[PDB]
A = this chain, B = another copy of it.
Amino acid sequence: MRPALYFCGSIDRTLYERIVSRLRRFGTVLTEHVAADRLIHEQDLEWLQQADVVVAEVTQPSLGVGYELGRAVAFNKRILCLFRPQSGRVLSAMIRGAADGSRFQVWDYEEGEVEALLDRYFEADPLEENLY
């Protein structure tokens, strides 16, 4: 089966659909139907552990997104966070500070470039190798 990708965002919808649509080129997006409480917590936890990579849109402040990122770090997951400074917000220091430039990355982006940034991210460290 294809790699499993976890898309994390705040429960924007047009941008989230573009992110999920692009990530489907790299594998199954486990949270695709969520994008489209104990039971919810358990299901997201099951999917986070299954994920090969966690891609989180962290522009909208969310306790849920933050919590899933904290659990993901504790699971030693490969994490990419996407933040849009054009929102006007200052990203939480806890999320910027968690970055280590390798396993946990935080990229500031402009809405128009998100598809190109996701291709860049998987070209540098693919989940499936390219054909010859």
Residues of A within 8 A of B (CB): 10-11, 37-42, 44, 58, 60-75, 91-99
Contact = CB atoms under 8 A, between A and B. Distances in A.
A11 B93 contact: yes
A44 to B, nearest CB: 7
A67 B95 contact: yes
**Interface residues of A: mostly helix, strand, loop or mixed?**
helix
Count of chain copies: 2
B73 A71 contact: yes
Contacts of A74: 70-71, 73-75
A42 B64 CA distance: 21
Nearest to A44: B94
A66 B44 CA distance: 14
B63 A98 contact: no
25 contacts: A10-B61, A37-B93, A37-B99, A38-B99, A40-B94, A40-B97, A41-B98, A44-B94, A61-B63, A62-B92, A63-B63, A63-B65, A63-B92, A64-B66, A64-B93, A66-B66, A66-B67, A66-B68, A67-B69, A67-B92, A67-B94, A67-B95, A68-B94, A70-B70, A70-B71
